[PDB]
Design a protein around this nucleic acid. Structure first.
Ligand code: CA
Ligand code: CA
Ligand code: CA
Ligand code: CA
Ligand code: ZN
Ligand code: ZN
Lengths: 550, 351, 550, 351
DNA sequence: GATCTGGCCTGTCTTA
DNA sequence: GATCTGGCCTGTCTTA
DNA sequence: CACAGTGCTACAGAC
DNA sequence: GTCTGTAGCACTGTGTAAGACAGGCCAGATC
DNA sequence: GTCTGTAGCACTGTGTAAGACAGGCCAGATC
DNA sequence: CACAGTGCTACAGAC
């Protein structure tokens, strides 16, 4: 027949229901068998290797306020809620891996590609085992409209929050000098195939209470983890890794939550900057990134202690929009996806107002505005082959901003100066878009990158000149973020799109197909099973078997 | 005795299962909004007015003198009445914030200015505490005592999070009763003394404190170690004599078994205890009246208002006392599609 | 090495995507292969047999207004719409099999089971081959919230209508003499495993114009087909079938809307009877089924032609509320599923009114309405482990109907004789339910069947006794239908609920998965390949292989 | 020459892509509606009142002695003017039933009674047709004519479903232009004479007919055989003599190429063709003016009301004439979720 | 002044 | 008579 | 410059 | 000269509910 | 004495938008 | 008395 690993991957990775699989096994076995596939209890017994709580490890130095037991599998994330009626309810169900263990397993799964990258380097083996550096992109994103199960309890809200990480790179430093030396780098970080779920909850993003209860332990894990280095026995030899954690993958509403910022249409628009709406309307293209964790924490202590007995209206100016204590650090970085969606829906709005003559007659009614939307969408479908939309998905946001789509909505606006204007605007946008959305603009799109600031300059000048009526005292968060802090970001990182929300976000699709086909399904067990099965979906060891060396 | 339904009108998303009602100078102010304060009302505190069945919440505004307060869930409130120097105070300590940590910092909340038009500004003065600090805890209770004639305060009870040795990210979210050492906090200065007594074997939680005339009666709370709901009533008697605050205690024959009770003052010192719970499963419907006198505290049950089958059948319920023998209760409500308002309310009144 | 048929059954029966499948094949073939599974192109010419437009057949006498070509496969159901701008636009995509061809393929696929049934009977197979009778339950039910695709054209509504059939039985008569003689009888008609799609459309149920344009051809071949008997070459010999078409699976609204009735809450409730609302209030248990196709047709010709010249009110009285010409013929029978849901929602409302005291205070406030809902659903979560619903699925109807579920509500109502009364009611209901739910009550549950009339009498008496305030001038359609015409139709069809909408409806779940896993995916081809792939899911030939013979 | 944007107020689910507008005795009633009539107005015919931009549809109720009508889609309307004995007539035949069929029966619809408050009862009368009956068809045209001095009627054009012998369930929904024979229908009695046309070697449809003084002008329409939209206009002239209604005809050199045109009367006999489709993609914007005199038809283009870019870009449009040089147009609309109104409207007027 | 009939709002029911 | 605050209600915006 | 598909048709490569 | 695997083709599904701010003004307390 | 297949366990997903009828009453037009 | 699952654990049967 075949080895149970190949069998397992050929189950996990083609999405076969266990009962579906076993159905097939019985069939191939009975008819002309000489059974090929391996039975279920021997896949399950081939399983325990790939999940966490298996490979032994040790941390130097020992981790702060964390158990030293390395065998722990899927843990109910409630994490000791005493469920006393007298206290806050235990309502929410969750399951999570103990973060460090999820890590070492995730990573020892890369032992293959790390040793093969090491041999590509032709690098020394016995020497320089310990100088490693590991960079982990983590992401947390919520999901609504999830029905629930009748079940025995406890009562729980509809919406579900999926906290996940992915290993972006791993590199080496020793002996010294030599920058640091990449070994492994995720080739398609936006694939579902690489995103590792860690915590699964049923929670609404809105309630902060249970979100911080269940993600609290996780944070103490990272924070207590940064200082230590991990010691893993791999390729026969124990080796010490340093982990550098960048949370890059959040939507801004949730960034604003985790950092105590007021949200999301607030006068203080920038997560990374202190400018108000008006001051960001005046000078668009010139800004300097300030906001980060440590200063947000000191900022809150000012808002609370308030040593200058200053009044609220003005106090909020002095702390510059921080009303709450941030419970997590996220790197000061933009998200690519909702940037693309935010700008796309913007130009959808400008087009719409531009059909009708907005700047001649400044005060349109509900009805002319609804009618403008009707001719706009009718035209887009008629030529660009794009149906009208409920909400702007980034996929309609990619077919919306192209020169073709603009030139199909150029036919609409009678004024021949305006066609010039919005047409040239859109070309400015296509010139600056790849800058943030490509993986490493330093290579793929260098000449757009070097021209970005100047390019955004003609853009903002073009808005504040011709379109000003719409931009005078109001600018979307994203236009500002994208016309201001991107050169600074790619200088600091070098990449934006690679850190985008996709891999978290896109993985939600899997979650839905795992709450239906591979669920248990009852309230108690079922998160455990979605989570396990996710972890397998996303492991490399299985996916290596896909090509089968072509 | 009576109760009548209340429509929460707009903005019933503010209330969370623990919360606190501050009754001072007539109107009472809700406290401990769900989540972090929204810039609709950044202060965090709401005046509440109940008119013709409608329950309306208004946005208070602090004075410039004040520190701003996080929405603590289940703190120890001790109302300190009017006298020199600066009446009248609500001592709030320390609860637990909308992130999960315990404040362990005492705040003093007072009225400031009015109206002009039906408007009340407030001021919050946090006070530094040197010691012998109280351990950060929640669901403990705090009370105001006056011995000849100096006024001090008594702080006891409550859970806290597991100490940072046994603290583990799998047990991180557990709690435990913090140890039984009363803390005598002078209002000013900030000196907190920690005493213990052989009569107190264990710490409690949610135990309703009554305080009059240099004596403090703790009703039966909920002990987490042996999981009993003591029917032993606890009394203690402190007198402050230069230069030590000497302290004594006694157990009582009989005390109530109820946790998470609502004490609504009606008479001079007479309160009506509603009670949250008889046992872990089954909530207390019975309504009780509790007076206290120098001889002792005298207990008389009064006929409880007839409960609509809803509140008689609801698994959990809470509320606060508007004072003047008037109080509010709150029932979670399951419905689909979402109400959205999560809590039906009822106003209850004595006589 | 599997036979390509067996492999194909593995594919469509375990829901494997072509690309998912081919993934599996490559993987098993590369590792240890010795490839087992058969390649794609050999499956694609493997099922040419199992689809329609393959086996040769002919009708005698030759069918009316239908072509004689038997090779036609999936046809675009637009069926020659000239799609001129000037005419009524063609906004709908559809695909359908030519009905007769779909039939002979269904039956040529039952060839196996009818031959093994014929042998089991020891009825001589070669002799007496011409007297067969084939009874076909057809069902048509629509589905909402199906998102349109960007695509090219044309513009099409969201809602989608799935028109199917299933072969209920096939039997024999000749030489003469005895009755007719069952051979094959569907053992689980309510399985989605046997529901054969025929016509797939994107149409809103509401617009009649398009629904009848597309289903018009289909009906014409039914009513042209009832006359002529079929000739198939099966078991080696030429044999002839009569077809008896029962449409039983329509839900109430659509019955009414294809029958020209006034839906759905109109004064004339019974689809099978002429009773008005208030007339069916006073008298309940006594009714006689009248409404039938030819009668509604003549009745329209009266409503239109109008020889007696009554005013609108009186005219609508004289035709008992037939305002429109029906086109399709539909059997006078009662759907079981929506009956179950309609009764459950009525008792859900009675409970709600008994929580509060409705008959004590007749005019309840709206706030107390909501308050009663909230304590009711609180109760049903604490006991019975049920969670509220917006629309009530029949599965919450099966947990609500039971007596021990009435027990958690009996604890809610303070009054003692009420608490007895509704408890007694519910036991009456459990006693009469199996009659119309079970497949064949003539055997499975005879005593409930014989006692049903007396049992319903008991019930309605109880209603008009203690509940009259709710029933005075108003009775839900299904309560009337179920307390009135059930004994009659069970006597007539012999059984009910075997005829339920269930076997159609369930299949909708497949239409959702088959529009994602196995869709093409683009507007043009998408219905074509869903429909094909559905048909293959349905075929017996494959499911036989998937049994693996124990 | 201008257009006012119109709101469909409530209930814009009625209007449908083909429909008809009956202007008789002042107010105009809409006719035909999506699907089968609903109990709200079972008659199927609505009064239309357009006030302050609002388009309001009202239920009309028939007289007891009248037949009830199916909501036809695209019938041939001929408005028969007042004379002995009984004005005012609308001859409707025969359209497409909402349950999809062609009806070959001819209705005469008219006014009966009012108000007592602003309510017009109507009466529908089928007419038995002695014949030599017209094949059931749609998009054909019908018009009233008077010769010396008696009055008869002329019916020609349109399509019909494939011949019932040749109609296959795959070609069922196909449709062909019915043969080119005119039917002279006496109003009473029911005698329908079918007449061949040496000049017309082809049938056509959607051809707007204008009838004055015993002569009938067929403006260009879509022919389905060669798919051409003839510029040639076709006039015919009917000779009613005892007892033979012999019929002549003639071709006109040059005329307008149009399909599905809206003829809105203005002057005595001067209608403006309001437009329609010129080709299978492009829709005629140009608004055109047509007088009819015994010399011939006098045709002058007129400056078309400037169209909002929406209707200038609309895939398709339709409408009807409210008469008095006033008419209505309708634009399908998209969005998400549904508007709900599938059609925006506009009102156009002359002078 | 004061009907009638609509018209909408509200109101609920009954189906999906 | 006429403020001020609070009120909703609306009129928007921005993010999801 | 998201990414893994989604089935079928042609169009090349393989004994 | 059949068999076999892969690129064309156009397109999906995962991105989904709250709050902030500004102006009006009517209600209602304060004098 | 390991290996293997099947029944316990509780529960899902497909049942998801319109219309009818009743009473009041304000608007609004005759008269 | 819808029906095919949904994964795991025990609990029997098989060389
Ligand atoms: Ca989100
Ligand atoms: Ca999401
Ligand atoms: Ca339906
Ligand atoms: Ca359905
Ligand atoms: Zn900024
Ligand atoms: Zn009936």
């Amino acid at each position: 027949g075949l080895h149970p690993a190949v069998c397992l991957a050929i189950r996990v990775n083609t999405f076969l229901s266990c009962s579906q699989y076993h159905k097939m096994y019985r069939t191939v076995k009975a008819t002309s068998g000489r059974q090929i596939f391996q039975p279920l209890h021997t896949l399950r017994n081939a399983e325990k290797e790939l999940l966490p709580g298996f490979h032994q490890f040790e941390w130097q130095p020992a981790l702060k306020n964390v158990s030293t037991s390395w065998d722990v599998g899927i843990i109910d994330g409630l994490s000791g809620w005493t469920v006393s009626v007298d206290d806050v309810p235990a309502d929410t169900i969750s399951r999570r891996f103990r973060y460090d263990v999820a890590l070492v397993s995730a990573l020892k799964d890369l032992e293959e590609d790390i040793m093969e990258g090491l041999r590509e380097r032709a690098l020394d083996d016995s020497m320089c085992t310990s100088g490693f550096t590991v960079v982990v992109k983590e992401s947390c994103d919520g999901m609504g409209d999830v029905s629930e199960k009748h079940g025995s309890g406890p009562a729980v809200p509809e919406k579900a929050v999926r906290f996940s990480f992915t290993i972006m790179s791993i590199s080496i430093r020793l002996e010294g000098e030599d920058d640091g030396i990449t070994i492994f780098q995720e080739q398609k970080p936006n694939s579902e195939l690489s995103c590792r779920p860690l915590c699964l909850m049923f929670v609404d993003e809105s309630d902060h209470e249970t979100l911080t209860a269940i993600l609290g332990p996780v944070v103490a894990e990272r924070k207590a983890m940064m200082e230590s280095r991990l010691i893993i026995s791999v390729g026969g030899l124990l080796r010490s890794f340093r982990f550098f954690f960048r949370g890059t993958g959040y939507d801004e509403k949730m960034v604003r939550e985790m950092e105590g910022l007021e949200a999301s249409g607030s006068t203080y628009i920038c997560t990374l900057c202190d400018s108000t709406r008006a001051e960001a309307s005046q000078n668009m293209v010139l800004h300097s990134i300030t906001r980060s964790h440590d200063e947000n924490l000191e900022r809150y202590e000012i808002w609370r202690k308030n040593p200058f007995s200053e009044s609220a209206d003005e106090l909020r100016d002095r702390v510059k929009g921080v009303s709450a204590k941030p419970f997590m650090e996220t790197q000061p970085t933009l998200d690519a996806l909702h940037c693309d969606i935010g700008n796309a829906t913007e130009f959808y709005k400008i087009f719409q107002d531009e059909i009708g003559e907005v700047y001649q007659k400044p005060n349109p009614s509900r009805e002319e505005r609804r009618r403008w939307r009707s001719t706009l969408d009718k035209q887009l479908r008629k030529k660009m082959k794009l149906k009208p939309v409920m909400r702007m998905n980034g996929n309609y946001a990619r077919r919306l901003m192209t020169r073709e789509a603009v030139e199909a909505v150029c036919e609409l606006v009678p004024s021949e100066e305006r066609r010039e204007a919005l047409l040239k605007l859109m070309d400015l946008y296509l010139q600056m878009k790849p800058v943030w959305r490509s993986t490493c603009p330093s290579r793929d799109c260098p000449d757009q990158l070097c021209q970005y600031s100047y390019n955004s300059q003609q853009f903002a000048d073009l808005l504040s000149s011709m379109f000003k009526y719409r931009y005078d005292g109001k600018i979307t968060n994203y236009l500002h973020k994208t016309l201001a802090h991107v050169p600074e970001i790619v200088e600091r990182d070098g990449s934006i799109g690679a850190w985008a929300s996709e891999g978290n976000e896109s993985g939600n699709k899997l979650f839905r197909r795992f709450r239906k086909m591979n669920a248990r399904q009852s309230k108690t067990f079922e998160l455990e099973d979605i989570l396990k099965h996710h972890w397998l979906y996303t492991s490399k060891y299985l996916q290596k078997f896909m090509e089968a060396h072509k | 005795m009576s109760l009548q339904p209340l429509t929460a009108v707009n903005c019933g998303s503010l209330v969370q299962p623990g919360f606190s009602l501050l009754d001072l100078e007539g109107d009472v102010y809700l406290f401990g909004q769900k989540g972090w304060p929204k810039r609709s009302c950044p202060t965090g505190i709401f005046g509440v007015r109940i008119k013709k069945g409608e329950l309306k919440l208004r946005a208070i505004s602090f004075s410039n003198n004040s520190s701003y307060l996080p929405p603590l869930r289940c703190p120890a409130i001790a109302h300190f009445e009017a006298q020199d120097g600066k009446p009248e105070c609500y001592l709030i300590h320390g609860g637990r914030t909308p992130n999960n940590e315990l404040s362990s910092s005492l705040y003093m909340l007072s009225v400031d200015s009015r109206g002009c038009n039906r408007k009340v500004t407030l001021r919050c003065e946090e006070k530094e505490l040197v010691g012998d600090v109280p351990s950060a805890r929640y669901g403990h209770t705090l009370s105001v005592i006056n011995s000849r004639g100096k006024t001090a305060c008594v702080l006891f009870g409550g859970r806290s999070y597991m100490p940072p040795t046994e603290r583990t990210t799998q047990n991180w979210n557990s709690v435990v009763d913090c140890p039984p050492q009363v803390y005598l906090i002078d209002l000013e200065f900030g000196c907190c003394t920690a005493h213990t007594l052989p009569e107190l074997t264990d710490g409690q939680s949610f135990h309703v404190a009554l305080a009059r005339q240099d004596c403090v009666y703790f009703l039966g709370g909920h002990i987490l170690s042996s999981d009993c709901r003591p029917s032993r009533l606890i009394r203690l008697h402190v007198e402050l004599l230069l230069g030590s605050p000497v302290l004594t205690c006694t157990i009582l024959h009989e005390g109530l078994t109820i946790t998470s009770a609502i004490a609504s003052p009606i008479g001079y010192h007479e309160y009506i205890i509603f009670g949250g719970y008889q046992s872990e499963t089954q909530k207390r419907m019975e309504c009780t009246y509790v007076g206290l006198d120098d001889v002792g505290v005298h207990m008389e049950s009064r006929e409880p208002p007839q409960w609509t089958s809803e509140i008689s059948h609801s698994r959990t319920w809470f509320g606060g006392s508007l004072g003047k023998g008037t109080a509010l209760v709150a029932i979670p409500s399951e419905g689909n599609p979402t109400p959205p308002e999560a809590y039906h309310f009822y106003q209850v009144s004595f006589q």
